[PDB]
Symmetry: C5
Amino acid sequence: NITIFTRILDGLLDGYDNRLRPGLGERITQVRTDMYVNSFGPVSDTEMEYTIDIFFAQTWKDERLRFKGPMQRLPLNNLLASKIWTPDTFFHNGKKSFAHWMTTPNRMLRIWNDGRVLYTLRLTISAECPMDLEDFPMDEQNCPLKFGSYAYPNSEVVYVWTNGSTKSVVVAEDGSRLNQYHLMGQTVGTENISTSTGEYTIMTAHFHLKRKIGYFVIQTYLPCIMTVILSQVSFWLNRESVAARTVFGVTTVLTMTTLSISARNSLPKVAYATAMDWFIAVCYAFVFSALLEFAFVNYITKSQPARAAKIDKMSRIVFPILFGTFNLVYWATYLN
Amino acid sequence: NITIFTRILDGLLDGYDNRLRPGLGERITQVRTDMYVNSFGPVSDTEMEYTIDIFFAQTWKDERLRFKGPMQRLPLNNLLASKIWTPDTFFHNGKKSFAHWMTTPNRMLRIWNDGRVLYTLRLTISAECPMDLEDFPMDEQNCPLKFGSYAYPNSEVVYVWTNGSTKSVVVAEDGSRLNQYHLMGQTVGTENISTSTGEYTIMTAHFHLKRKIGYFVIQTYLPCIMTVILSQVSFWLNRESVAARTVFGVTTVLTMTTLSISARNSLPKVAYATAMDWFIAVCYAFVFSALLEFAFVNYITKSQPARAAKIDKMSRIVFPILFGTFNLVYWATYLN
Amino acid sequence: NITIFTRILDGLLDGYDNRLRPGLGERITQVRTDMYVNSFGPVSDTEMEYTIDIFFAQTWKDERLRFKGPMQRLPLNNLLASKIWTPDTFFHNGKKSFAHWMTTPNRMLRIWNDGRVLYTLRLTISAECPMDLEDFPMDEQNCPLKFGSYAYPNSEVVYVWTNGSTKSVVVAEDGSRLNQYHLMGQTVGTENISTSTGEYTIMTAHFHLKRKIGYFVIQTYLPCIMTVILSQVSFWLNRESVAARTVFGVTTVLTMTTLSISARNSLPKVAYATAMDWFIAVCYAFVFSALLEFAFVNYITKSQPARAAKIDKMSRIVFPILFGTFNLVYWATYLN
Amino acid sequence: NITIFTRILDGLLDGYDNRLRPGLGERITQVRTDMYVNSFGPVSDTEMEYTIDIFFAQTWKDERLRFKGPMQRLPLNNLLASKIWTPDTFFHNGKKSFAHWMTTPNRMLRIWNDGRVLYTLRLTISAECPMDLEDFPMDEQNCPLKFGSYAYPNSEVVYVWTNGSTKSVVVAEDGSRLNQYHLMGQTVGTENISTSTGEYTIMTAHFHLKRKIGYFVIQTYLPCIMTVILSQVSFWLNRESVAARTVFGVTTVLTMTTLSISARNSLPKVAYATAMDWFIAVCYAFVFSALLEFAFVNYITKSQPARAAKIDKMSRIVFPILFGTFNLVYWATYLN
Amino acid sequence: NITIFTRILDGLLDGYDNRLRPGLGERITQVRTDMYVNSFGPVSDTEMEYTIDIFFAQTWKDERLRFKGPMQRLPLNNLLASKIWTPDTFFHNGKKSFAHWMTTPNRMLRIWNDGRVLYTLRLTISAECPMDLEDFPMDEQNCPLKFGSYAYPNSEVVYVWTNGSTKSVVVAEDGSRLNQYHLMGQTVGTENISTSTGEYTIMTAHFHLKRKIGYFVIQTYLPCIMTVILSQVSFWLNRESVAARTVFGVTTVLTMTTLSISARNSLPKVAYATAMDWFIAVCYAFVFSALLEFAFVNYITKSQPARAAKIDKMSRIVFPILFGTFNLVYWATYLN
Ligand SMILES: CN1C(=O)CN=C(c2ccccc2)c2cc(Cl)ccc21
Ligand SMILES: CN1C(=O)CN=C(c2ccccc2)c2cc(Cl)ccc21
Ligand SMILES: CN1C(=O)CN=C(c2ccccc2)c2cc(Cl)ccc21
Ligand SMILES: CN1C(=O)CN=C(c2ccccc2)c2cc(Cl)ccc21
Ligand SMILES: CN1C(=O)CN=C(c2ccccc2)c2cc(Cl)ccc21
Ligand SMILES: *[C@@H]1O[C@H](CO)[C@@H](O)[C@H](O)[C@H]1NC(C)=O
Ligand SMILES: *[C@@H]1O[C@H](CO)[C@@H](O)[C@H](O)[C@H]1NC(C)=O
Ligand SMILES: *[C@@H]1O[C@H](CO)[C@@H](O)[C@H](O)[C@H]1NC(C)=O
Ligand SMILES: *[C@@H]1O[C@H](CO)[C@@H](O)[C@H](O)[C@H]1NC(C)=O
Ligand SMILES: *[C@@H]1O[C@H](CO)[C@@H](O)[C@H](O)[C@H]1NC(C)=O
């Protein structure tokens, strides 16, 4: 009962043209789309791109492939995929999208008596996600994913999500493979765009990203905090030890300078000030200000020692208090 | 006696459709799989991927290729591989899998009178291995390898290991080419998954990895240990040498700070504290604490020299003892 | 009413040769071109290349595809693109240009009764943009984009912009994805070139680029400015503290030296002096000159203390004034 | 006299099946192989791979292509290469081997009356060469190159070198393009391997590599030697200059620490001690030991100055002598 | 008058075999070659490769494509390129050569009544240029470019430049895109090579390269010069300031050491001494020698102060003079 299937396949192909869409000149082709994200890949800030692997599924109705037989379903493989007409779907923001070939071309194609068709297609999309690094690292990003049609305007092909929007897009629980982000949720929608040729249908999915802090705390914030504390120790050393206090001030200032260079090496070369830069700038003033206090004190330690000694003791208390007060404002404002 | 073989090949192809599986509508196709890992490639922690080269072998029974002749075996090459039906096997976790082309496409195909078939296929799979770096570097990882079918549910195609599981997967003795891991052993199993289309068969193989220590000992642990010892030398210097003791404390603190930055450059940017980070943090306190002791001593060396001198001598003994005691707890706990 | 279209397509292909241009031996083929830049990619100074993604559109008239039927337009896909003749357009400066393949080959083809044709083609061009880094970073660049024909001289194929030049090239408002440049505007034009074979038509588009400053201010300029200020603090320290003033001078000089090396690491290895190099050179003299003043003062502080003390006080005022005066000339000259 | 050749080619192809080896069921096919290495590419220690470009030549006898005519030789190109049967040769250790395509596919094929055939094939093999870095950099490596057959066991296809082994493999005098190795010589041999399918023939070629020293001398050895000499200068400074001697000891110790980190950055992350590591470890003790001597001397310079002064003078002589004595043992042992 | 051309093309292909060269068994095919270098790409010292883009043109006479008609020329495209016989030209030293595909395959093909043919082919060749870095950076290099035939010996195919050698190779004025080299000129020639198969014709073109200095002056030479000057300032400081002079000597020595490591990071790991290395070695002695002078002076400043003071003053003059004298010899010898 196998040769019976062979005759059915041969008959449908004969008299069938793959260069023409179903319902041409009679109606408008309607396509139902569903998605399942297997893994959300890493996000590269420098390249403003993210990698995503999905099992894209599409469905459309064709009246030219109707048949009757013992079975109502015809499981198949990539061999027959190119023999019939399929939509020229593309991703608008996809810089470079490539499919999978080995071990076998990941494709499927099924047909039913009523003309319903199914066409799954594994993909690996390296899309582009622009990001505004104004509140970095306390920033939230919305990386989109837009897919539609190239040569078929809305008057011919229209894409609509199957069933409700809740089940339209599915993300695996373990599919979040981000080392510096949290996948809060997803949103979907539809819209139209206008060009010279005509209107087109756009299906859009947005992923809400919440960055996870903790890597920069151990990398930039803590060294800056400890460096500031190191300089303040000089305030507890007697003035006559000019050389000893000089070493503390000079080393700390250079240490802060090199940290700023190192921090931005991996960060994108954005031409504006981020939140982290302001924190380093404030820490720079504290260490720099302490050095000035020593120089001013050392210059009047002879004529009027009383004022110099009074300032030194006062500095021990004022400086730590201001640093602690500033931190609460900085963290509370951003974490609220 | 060569043209006799030519007629046999031509006859089988005629009347044979490669788009339909054997036993369609009559039974369920059964596939027997065996593997031989030639080389386990390097594991990239940053990319969470590992490279593996295997000689994948598959076997299935087809009743449409039966023949009789002088020979019961028909050795062949890649030429006839695409002329018949082969399963659309794929790797679920394979990010990007590509076969080999030169010098000649590495493929084979053999047939027997009873319909038994053999299809070997060399492969180079760059799979993805998620890892939890909580006990790093004293961590054990289990990198999996899942392969199955794309368009053929369990009702049609089922994969089962040939013979026992012991001989199902073979790893060469010299095939372990890991510079920072040990290949302890392997495990295999089977499971099913459910999706919209239907149930599918999953064949899984797990590799147990035990990291080898010794690279980080010479890179991070030892410099931290020697840096701590350097600071303690200051306790054996007289107080009046304020400048000399200042150099020891400042240089050591900055040395520890830069080591932390350097260590995590190669390590993945995990947003949580590893075991190595805690060790560096403890070493940071020791050098930092020593600097505080000098500052406190230098501030009361005049009013009450007796207490300052007593503290200095006590510090020489307490500090080394605590560092030695802590090391035993750290190493014993992780190495046990 | 679908099979009617099938007959039309078959008839046109028969008797139609794709190896010959329309109007061969009768007239000169005329092509109308329009462009829409979806995104202007990043500019790599080291590689002197920039990436651009466009939706290139072309139009030409052919008398061999005329037909009459219910519809005056025949939307199609990549299937029929290769079946007919299309110009062998190429980019002269394109080092490596590749099209898009997945999810479907991004191409379109439409025909009309009068013979008018449309052929859109998505592209990603990695062109080369030579740049003269003489006023870097205060520099303006004009990256061109030249496209024409390879084997068809001007006597056969001529390219002309459609409608006016204003609408010939369109750039999306959000298509400017440059992190270190501003897209001021665009210009277009036409020209001819002469070679051994004959004359050819050239269509050129130029993009005016204005670099955005602010990344180098936080990276190179500010550390140099703060480093100079650090050295001048030594002028407020008494001469007897020889060791203390030595630390300031030595550390600052080495700090400037390493900044110069770090700055040019990312910058292209141009064999001539840039504007930034001169700024660093001036800052080098200030810190170096201060060290010389201390050495000269320390060498005559005994024989004639009066002159040494007078010079030290004068240095406190002259040095800051000159640095401030120089900055106004440097910034005003370049920013004007 | 050109059409005469055309008839000969057409006749041979008709009735000739490329899917069957010559002498099938009658004898065992014998293949003669010769090689000419155009250039031995660079060896990447990190990737344990080396690149080699060769002009591989193969020869086998087929009785199905016999002909008679004016010429006994038929020079041809890649066009006819795929029309006949060729062995499915492959490289066992080749991770990723690709041929050359432009300007024209580099292939050749010649036939003679007796059935002798020639098939040259340019190749670029990126093989894998495991190396044991125990005597690094005084190490000798033997990178192999194994090639055989995939689907044809020894009972069907056997590879044997043509003529003697001396002329079997040829390496160009200028083909050695190694910047850190010397190509001492080559060796060849044959062996069999056993698998599930059956026995296979293996043809192996080994290249003997002798590393050239001189890059590491200027990079690691000399800085370590000069750093040790710098510390010993402190022994010629009076004890009262506590600060001056402190700077020498601290700077040298940190300098050695950073050199160890820098040296292993390029070197593979081997989890065992190399010869170079031991040399750095010995140098670490010398500088570290000198610092301890100063601390111990400074702690008893008051109670018993005589012993402290005596030790200081003795250290000036003992330390340099031991360093010189150790170097002779280290270099002589490895260079002998 | 278009169908007339169609008949001509069809007739020529019929009865024409592309697997046989023209004049087979009657004469020797002669090929005329001309080149036009559009852009000389960057030269990578580490990889010993350079990229070049050319418009290669070839010409040969075939008597099997003669025709008569209204036009004596048949402009065409890549469609007919593969339908006829073309030489299997290849580049001997080309590691990896690839052609251009988009927007259209860059190829052309023209035919004339007498049988003359033209075949242009755009190319991007990543050739290999061995270089001897003995006088680096004052070195001159001659990167060659060899092209010939693979399967056609001299007895069948011979390559000869068209017209004179002056016009044989053309380089655009703006085609020199080298950031660290000057394109002085070009030379061409012919030669034969002998192998097992037979003699072959070689066409060679050499490009003379003169490196441009100025990048290394700002990177390595100047920091070394300024570092030496910094150390000499210590000679103008009184002996009693032991700590101050110690800082100058130690910092300068370490600064020179790190510069040597940094300089060779980008430079190829050549296992022999370059000219730049000797310059750094001389600078190393000057700073190192100054430190020794201070140590020796400080050790005898009590017993015989007169000799120590006399040496210190003499050092101020001798050391600067020797450094200036050495520079003239170094620069004059290499720049002459
Ligand atoms: C609005 N618009 C145009 O006018 C150019 N044509 C298109 C287009 C072309 C084919 C199909 C859909 C859309 C296009 C594509 C993008 Cl990704 C952004 C804007 C845009
Ligand atoms: C359970 N599931 C789905 O629902 C989506 N479809 C599939 C699938 C699709 C085709 C064959 C097998 C499985 C799939 C694939 C992975 Cl890798 C993980 C989950 C998953
Ligand atoms: C003027 N010229 C030549 O003489 C070589 N031929 C060409 C050419 C070849 C085919 C089509 C167009 C132009 C060419 C191409 C460039 Cl990109 C620059 C200069 C140049
Ligand atoms: C001994 N062996 C096997 O059992 C697996 N099959 C093979 C094989 C498969 C086809 C041809 C030759 C050999 C093989 C290949 C290597 Cl590279 C190493 C061991 C090994
Ligand atoms: C002299 N020689 C040989 O003997 C090996 N065969 C060849 C060859 C093979 C085919 C065509 C031309 C030349 C060859 C190629 C090079 Cl690139 C260098 C040396 C060499
Ligand atoms: C998009 O076009 C379709 C055409 O049927 C229309 O129904 C729909 O309302 C449009 N959507 C928007 C947002 O304009
Ligand atoms: C998987 O499906 C097969 C269907 O025959 C069944 O026999 C087997 O028990 C299932 N395995 C599991 C783990 O459910
Ligand atoms: C280019 O060639 C065309 C040929 O028709 C001519 O009309 C045009 O004036 C030429 N342009 C220039 C700038 O020479
Ligand atoms: C390999 O197999 C062949 C089979 O003919 C045999 O002659 C040869 O001795 C074998 N070599 C070894 C090393 O066993
Ligand atoms: C190369 O071979 C040709 C064969 O005709 C000969 O004429 C020519 O002189 C040879 N050139 C050299 C340099 O030997």
